């Protein structure tokens, strides 16, 4: 809690009232980790950030349906 209160991640501090565990994930691969925790229904993911953009769970599952990064670069 002090490292979240003093740094730029103060908006993530309300997600830490119970037993919470962190999913540190270099090179974000979000679709398949959603696909492996959709096996167990009782496991929430309360949110987090994606590259300094704080996002919710339904935000995560609609972030997974962003198109592939080459075509996202090639749209503009």
């Amino acid at each position: 809690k002090p490292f979240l209160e003093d740094s730029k991640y103060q908006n993530l501090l309300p997600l830490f009232v119970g037993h919470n565990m962190l999913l540190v994930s270099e090179e974000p691969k979000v679709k398949e980790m959603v696909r492996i925790l959709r096996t167990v229904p009782f496991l929430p993911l309360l949110g987090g950030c994606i590259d300094d953009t704080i996002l919710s769970r339904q935000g995560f599952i609609n972030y997974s349906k962003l198109p592939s990064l080459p075509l996202v670069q090639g749209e503009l």
Partner: peptide, 27 residues
Amino acid sequence: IQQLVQDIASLTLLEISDLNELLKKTL
């Protein structure tokens, strides 16, 4: 006109998504 180069290289993923949304609706 490489100002575009710098301010789009500083652009994040969903930042580029917002740019896509805005310019496509405008264009």
